[PDB]
Design a protein around this ligand. Structure first.
Ligand SMILES: CN1CCN(C(=O)c2nonc2N)CC1
Ligand SMILES: CN1CCN(C(=O)c2nonc2N)CC1
Lengths: 240, 240
C-alpha cells in the first residue's frame, strides 16, 4: 500500500467506520491505505484481561495499564519496520490543521496510539511517542475518533484516493438543482457558462466569507494581486 | 433519553463506532443518549437511488442532491418534534472548542447533517440549518466523523454517562505502575500521600505545560491568586 497506519486501540472495531465505508473504505479495499489494529487487551496475562490501572497520587480516574499498552506498541513497531512515526492523540498535543495534515501525510508509515480513561503514563510518552497531536481543543472519551479523523484527513493526499484550504480560504457557496428552491435563486453568473467570471465569483465569495467569519485566517495569508482586488470589492459591497 | 440526536448520513453504519462501544455505547444502551439515523438514499425515487448532483457553474466535484437530503432532513425534524437545533458540520462553521461543546450540550435535541462530496446546496443551509460548526481547520471526506466527534464530546455532559479544560488548562502528567519504567521514576510527591501537595503539584504542572505548549490559552484566563503563584514558580524553575 501507499500509506500504512498501525493503530493501538481497545476498540479496534470502531475503525470499521473508516475501513468499510466511503472514500476511505475504497482506499482500503484498493490497497492504497492499510489500517492494522493491535488491542492492548490481547497483550494481557491476567484472567480478567485488565487494561486499566490506578494513578499514583490518587484522583477519580484510571489510566491505561502500562504493560499491555507498551507490549502492543512494541508489536506494532515491529510490524511497521523502519521509519514509522508514532503519534499519541491528546488535547496536550500540537493542534491539527490542514498544514499539519499535509506534514503528516508525508509519512509512508504512522502508528497511532489511542488513549482511553484519563490517558497514558507520561513516561510512555517520553519513551515510545514521537509526536503528540490534538484534533481540537475539546475533550473526547478516547483517542479513536481523533485517530480516525487523522486517517481520513491524510488519506485524501494518497494518489488515487480522490478523483478552499488549498489556499487557506473558506469554501465558496455551492448550488445544484433546482434553479429555484423555496424562492431562492441560483446566482445567474453560475448559469452563464462564463468560466472566468465563475472562477472570479467563487474566489471573491471565498474571500468575503473568510473575512466575515474567520478574519484571523486572512492575516496569515499573502494575498495575490487578484485576491486583494476581489477582497476590496467584496468589502466595498458589504459597506454599500 | 436525556439527549436525542438525529443524524442525516449516507453512511449510517459508521455511527456504530459510537453507539456500540465504550462510554458512548454504554450511554446508548442505558437510554441516556439516543442516536437515530436517516439516510438520504432511502428518500430517492429513481432506479439507481441517486444521491449526488452536478454543481451549477461547473467544477470537478459533485454536491449532495437536494431533494433526497431535504426530505431526510424534514423527516428527522418531524421525529424530533419542537425545539431541535439543526447543525451542519463543515470547515465554514464556527470552530468547536470545549466552551462550544458545553453550549451545544444544553440542547435536549440536535439534528446533525453530514455532508459528502463537495457539500450541500447553500440554499439548504439558509432554509434548513440553524447553526454551522467545524471540528477543526482541516478537510475530511465527509461530515460523519465530525458528527461522531461532536456526539462523543457532548455525551460527556449527560448525567450518568461518566463516573484540565475544566479550567482552560492542559492536563497534568499522569503516572501509574511500575514505580520505575526504563529508568524513569514517578515524581516522589505523587507517592507521598500528601493530598494538598499533590493537588498543587498537578496544578503547577498544568500551568507549566499550558505556558510552554499553548501560551495563547493562558491569555484567555483570569488566573486565581494560587494559579498566579504556581505559574510564577514554574517559570522561575524553567529559567533556573
Ligand atoms: C485519554 N484521551 C482523552 C480524550 N482525548 C482527546 O480528547 C483528544 N485526542 O486527540 N485530540 C483530542 N482532543 C484523547 C486522549
Ligand atoms: C462536505 N464535507 C466536507 C468535509 N467536511 C469537514 O471537513 C468538516 N466537517 O466538520 N468540520 C470539518 N472540518 C464536512 C463537509
Amino acid at each position: 500500500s501507499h500509506m500504512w497506519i498501525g493503530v493501538i486501540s481497545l476498540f479496534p472495531e470502531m475503525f470499521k467506520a473508516i475501513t468499510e465505508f466511503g472514500v476511505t473504505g475504497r482506499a482500503v479495499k484498493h490497497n492504497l491505505l492499510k489500517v492494522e489494529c493491535w488491542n492492548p487487551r490481547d497483550f494481557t496475562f491476567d484472567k480478567h484481561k485488565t487494561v486499566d490501572d490506578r494513578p499514583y497520587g490518587g484522583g477519580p480516574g484510571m489510566l491505561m495499564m502500562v504493560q499491555p499498552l507498551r507490549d502492543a506498541i512494541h508489536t506494532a513497531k515491529a510490524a511497521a519496520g523502519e521509519g514509522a512515526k508514532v503519534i499519541y492523540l491528546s488535547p496536550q498535543g500540537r493542534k491539527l490543521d490542514q498544514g499539519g495534515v499535509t506534514e503528516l501525510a508525508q509519512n509512508q508509515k504512522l502508528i497511532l496510539v489511542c488513549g482511553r480513561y484519563e490517558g497514558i503514563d507520561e513516561r510512555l510518552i517520553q519513551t515510545e511517542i514521537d509526536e503528540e497531536w490534538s484534533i481540537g481543543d475539546y475533550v473526547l472519551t478516547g483517542g479513536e475518533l481523533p485517530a480516525m479523523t487523522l486517517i481520513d484527513a491524510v488519506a485524501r493526499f494518497i494518489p488515487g484516493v480522490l478523483g478552499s484550504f488549498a489556499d487557506g480560504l473558506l469554501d465558496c457557496p455551492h448550488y445544484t438543482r433546482p434553479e429555484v428552491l423555496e424562492g431562492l435563486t441560483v446566482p445567474p453568473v453560475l448559469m452563464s457558462g462564463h468560466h472566468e467570471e465563475i472562477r472570479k465569483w467563487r474566489l471573491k465569495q471565498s474571500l468575503q466569507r473568510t473575512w466575515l467569519r474567520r478574519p484571523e485566517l486572512l492575516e496569515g495569508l499573502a494575498l495575490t494581486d487578484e485576491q486583494r482586488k476581489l477582497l476590496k470589492e467584496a468589502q466595498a459591497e458589504h459597506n454599500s
